[PDB]
Amino acid sequence: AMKLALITDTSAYLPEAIENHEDVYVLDIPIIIDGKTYIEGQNLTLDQYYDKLAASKELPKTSQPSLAELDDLLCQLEKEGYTHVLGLFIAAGISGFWQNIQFLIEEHPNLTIAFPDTKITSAPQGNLVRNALMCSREGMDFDVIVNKIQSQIEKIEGFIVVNDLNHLVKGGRLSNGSAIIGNLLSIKPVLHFNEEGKIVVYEKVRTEKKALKRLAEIVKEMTADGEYDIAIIHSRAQDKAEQLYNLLAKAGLKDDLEIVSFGGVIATHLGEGAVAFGITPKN
Ligand SMILES: CCCCCCCC/C=C/CCCCCCCC(=O)O
Numbered sequence: 133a134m135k136l137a138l139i140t141d142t143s144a145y146l147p148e149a150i151e152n153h154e155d156v157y158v159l160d161i162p163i164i165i166d167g168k169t170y171i172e173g174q175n176l177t178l179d180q181y182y183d184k185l186a187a188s189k190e191l192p193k194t195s196q197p198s199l200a201e202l203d204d205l206l207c208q209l210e211k212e213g214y215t216h217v218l219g220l221f222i223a224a225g226i227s228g229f230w231q232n233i234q235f236l237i238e239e240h241p242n243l244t245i246a247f248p249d250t251k252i253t254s255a256p257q258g259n260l261v262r263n264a265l266m267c268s269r270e271g272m273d274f275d276v277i278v279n280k281i282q283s284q285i286e287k288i289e290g291f292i293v294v295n296d297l298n299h300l301v302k303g304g305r306l307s308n309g310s311a312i313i314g315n316l317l318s319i320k321p322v323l324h325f326n327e328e329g330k331i332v333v334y335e336k337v338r339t340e341k342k343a344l345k346r347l348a349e350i351v352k353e354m355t356a357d358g359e360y361d362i363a364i365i366h367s368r369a370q371d372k373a374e375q376l377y378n379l380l381a382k383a384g385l386k387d388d389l390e391i392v393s394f395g396g397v398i399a400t401h402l403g404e405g406a407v408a409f410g411i412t413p414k415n
Pocket residue numbers: 161193194195196197222226227228229252253254255256289290291292305365397398401402408409410411
């Protein structure tokens with residue numbers, strides 16, 4: 133008789149149906165401005181965020197969610213009667229949170245716990261949570277769910293075109309960024325997540341027009357092997373997303389296509405004006 137909890141962080145973009153689910157727990161990710169404002173939804177709205185972004189002369193940072201909060205949540209779940217836990221957090225390659233939480237599995241021996249590296253964030257992450265839920269709701273064993281999710285983690289893809297690369301380079305989530313930045317400044321590169329879940333340059337594309345067109349072509353390639361939920365995601369780049377939406381509408385892919393926003397967590401590392409897509413296998 134499994135009672136399974138789902139833990140994630142606020143970088144995951146959660147489907148509408150899964151939002152307020154009673155087995156879903158969401159850890160907060162702090163943003164650090166001048167030390168000024170800190171947690172979206174408590175202490176900082178998205179509009180205040182962008183206002184604070186424009187006005188600072190230093191870049192914002194983020195920090196890992198609290199190890200102590202996870203620790204205390206795990207203990208709370210154990211006494212709330214949960215038997216298994218699946219933790220689906222932000223990519224290991226863009227935050228050491230995944231590596232940092234691993235010891236916690238040994239510290240709570242009264243639960244069966246899996247923290248697989250999602251290698252993604254935003255909407256694919258949220259889709260994983262949702263997927264694991266329907267799997268649970270389908271009577272599937274913990275190892276099998278974990279299994280299905282790991283193989284799903286393998287088909288997920290995340291491609292990005294940013295407006296300005298400083299956020300990615302100086303924030304440090306673009307790999308080898310300070311060595312390659314001089315080459316990318318005059319152009320509009322297409323970026324993606326690695327096999328290790330790192331952000332690397334997929335392709336040098338010279339113009340923004342061709343960049344977006346190239347994104348639509350990439351979606352068509354990536355989704356050729358099955359049925360995918362597709363998300364266009366932007367940080368105040370409405371027009372770039374509607375454009376890509378139309379490119380994908382034309383290509384025949386309108387049906388599982390949704391436009392969603394980034395929060396301050398990812399805006400911090402991507403900058404404003406960013407556009408991306410993420411795909412996730414259908415459950
Ligand atoms: C479809 C996927 C597109 C989304 C691209 C997301 C890239 C942005 C990267 C986010 C990094 C935020 C990490 C928060 C933890 C802080 C880690 C630290 O400084 O100690």
